[PDB]
Amino acid sequence: SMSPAYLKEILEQLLEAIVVATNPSGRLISELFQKLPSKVQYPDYYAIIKEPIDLKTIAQRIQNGSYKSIHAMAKDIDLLAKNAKTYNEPGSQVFKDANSIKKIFYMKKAEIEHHE
Ligand SMILES: [Cl-]
Ligand SMILES: [Cl-]
Ligand SMILES: [Zn+2]
Ligand SMILES: [Zn+2]
């Protein structure tokens, strides 16, 4: 049973891996995932997406100690990606970036959990 302090460091490392990741273009994969869209300008989004989430919210949850396991953060990352892949058309760059974020997260998780 790792301490809350140890868990936090792990979660921070996972988030960092996501937010520093770049595409071949050099663009940050995380760019369009930092902040949810305006409720005023994009009301359709909130009618369609039942549980909105963004990277800012996930970061806040890490700081709040809201997550009691790496799994809980992982489920939020899954949701982050699922929502983008629900509201946005497949093949789109946002769709691709959603998957890339998951790939980065789970690769980093494995690196951390399996290193010996
Ligand atoms: Cl495993
Ligand atoms: Cl494992
Ligand atoms: Zn394992
Ligand atoms: Zn090692």
Author numbering: 176 to 291
The authors write:
BRDs are evolutionarily conserved and present in diverse nuclear proteins comprising HATs (GCN5, PCAF), ATP-dependent chromatin-remodeling complexes (BAZ1B), helicases (SMARCA), methyltransferases (MLL, ASH1L), transcriptional coactivators (TRIM/TIF1, TAFs) transcriptional mediators (TAF1), nuclear-scaffolding proteins (PB1), and the BET family (Muller et al., 2011). The most notable structural difference within the BRD core fold is a hairpin insertion located between helix αZ and the ZA loop that is present in all family VIII members. The proximity to the Kac binding site suggests that this insert may play a role in recruitment of acetylated binding partners. The nuclear body protein SP140 as well as the related protein LOC93349 and PCAF showed nonspecific binding to most peptides. In contrast, the second, fourth, fifth, and sixth BRD of PB1, MLL, and TRIM28 interacted with only a few histone Kac peptides.
Bromodomains (BRDs) are protein interaction modules that specifically recognize ε-N-lysine acetylation motifs, a key event in the reading process of epigenetic marks. The 61 BRDs in the human genome cluster into eight families based on structure/sequence similarity. Despite large sequence variations, all BRD modules share a conserved fold that comprises a left-handed bundle of four α helices (αZ, αA, αB, αC), linked by loop regions of variable length (ZA and BC loops), which line the Kac binding site and determine binding specificity. The four helices form a deep cavity that is extended by the two loop regions (ZA and BC loops), creating a largely hydrophobic Kac binding pocket.
